[PDB]
Amino acid sequence: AQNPNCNIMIFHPTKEEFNDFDKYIAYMESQGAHRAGLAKIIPPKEWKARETYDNISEILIATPLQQVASGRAGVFTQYHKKKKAMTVGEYRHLANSKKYQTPPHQNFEDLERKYWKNRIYNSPIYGADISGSLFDENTKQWNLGHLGTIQDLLEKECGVVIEGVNTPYLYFGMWKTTFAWHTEDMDLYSINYLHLGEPKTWYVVPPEHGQRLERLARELFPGSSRGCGAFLRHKVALISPTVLKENGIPFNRITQEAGEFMVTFPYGYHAGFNHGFNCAEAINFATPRWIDYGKMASQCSCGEARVTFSMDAFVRILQPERYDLWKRGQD
């Protein structure tokens, strides 16, 4: 069995290997990359996402989110308070202000220590989940707005044609902005490209051990667990590496820098934080190997998780028994 310790693998494809996206994902899996739940892909030196980032300041962040924490430093939830719209140029200036800027630090490990010590005492503002793309239309390789759609994959594998669309999302971050522990909708893959700025640190639980994280989460968030049998779908709970280690939960960590791709694999729980002002682009995707994970994915039916239009068909076709209850949650 390849990668039996479920380590995060790092790949350096050549320009020739960067042509065929599906083939390269399948290669990485042949080497056991999925066992970690997360992989890093460093593009060939010939490649670029676009020519420059000099003209992005007028992008609008219609609903910036202030991430307010509750709990203790290693075990907390966050809620998202909506803020007034601002442009990317306004948000960059805000991120660099004395109130929000990254503190002085020695290295990524020192910064990580400072994040876990102090995150809860601040409320950073995240420009998350903005439909759009920063890939140039002429970028032919690993262009996250030109991937095969999940609807077409389902149709290719299973023969059923369904409604829905699959487009990318932009994330503008600042110091301490946080992504809570989650798997993707319908336990899909994700791919995330860090276009510019400061790094993003990731934590990940191997897919084969995801239920260990779920059991800890039920223990640590006991009211939330009574509320919903899949409350990590709400994307609000944080658990630190120290707490994970104390509870024997297998995980790994890695820091993504600008110009790098990360892939999350089906049922790979992940969480993390931004080091300072940055911009990432991410989208979900599927492969043939996903189908069995989609059929088994948990679902939130309490009403909190509320998701895209396109998840309807995935539930309807892959999980017809759950469909009725899940849809009640959506309505």
Ligand X SMILES: O=C(O)CNC(=O)C(=O)O
Q: Point out the annotated binding site for Zn(2+).
A: 228, 234, 300, 302
Task: State the Cα–Cα distance between residues 60 and 62, nearest whole angstrom.
Answer: 6
Stretch that binds Zn ion, among 216-224, 226-234, 307-315, 318-326 (CB under 5 A): 226-234
- Rule CB under 6 A: which residues touch ligand X? 171, 179, 190, 192, 264, 270, 280, 282
Identity of the amino acid at 126: Y
**Beta strands 9-11 and 38-41, pairing class:** parallel
Residue 302 binds Zn ion, judged by CB under 5 A: yes
Stretch that binds Zn ion, among 131-139, 239-247, 262-270, 304-312 (CB under 5 A): 304-312
Give the helix/strand (H/E) hosting 252: strand 252-256
Q: What are phi and psi of 75, to 5 degrees?
A: -145, 100
User: Which C-beta is closer to ligand X: that of 67 or that of 299?
Assistant: 67
Residue 228 binds Zn ion, judged by CB under 5 A: yes
Going from the C-alpha of 282 to that of each of 119, 168, 179, 259, the distances in angstroms are 24, 6, 13, 13
User: Which C-beta is closer to Zn ion: that of 9 or that of 228?
Assistant: 228
Q: What is the DSSP string of 36-68?
A: GSEEEEPPPTT--S-S-STT-TT-EESS-EEEE
Stretch that binds Zn ion, among 171-179, 254-262, 275-283, 292-300 (CB under 5 A): 292-300
304 binds, among Ni ion, Zn ion, Mg ion, none (CB under 5 to 8 A by kind): Zn ion
Task: State the Cα–Cα distance between residues 88 and 86, nearest whole angstrom.
Answer: 7
Identity of the amino acid at 269: Y
Residue 58 binds Mg ion, judged by CB under 5 A: yes
Q: What are phi and psi of 25, to 5 degrees?
A: -60, -45
User: Which C-beta is closer to ligand X: that of 143 or that of 190?
Assistant: 190
User: Which C-beta is closer to ligand X: that of 240 or that of 264?
Assistant: 264
Q: Which residues bind Mg ion (CB under 5 A)?
A: 56, 58-59
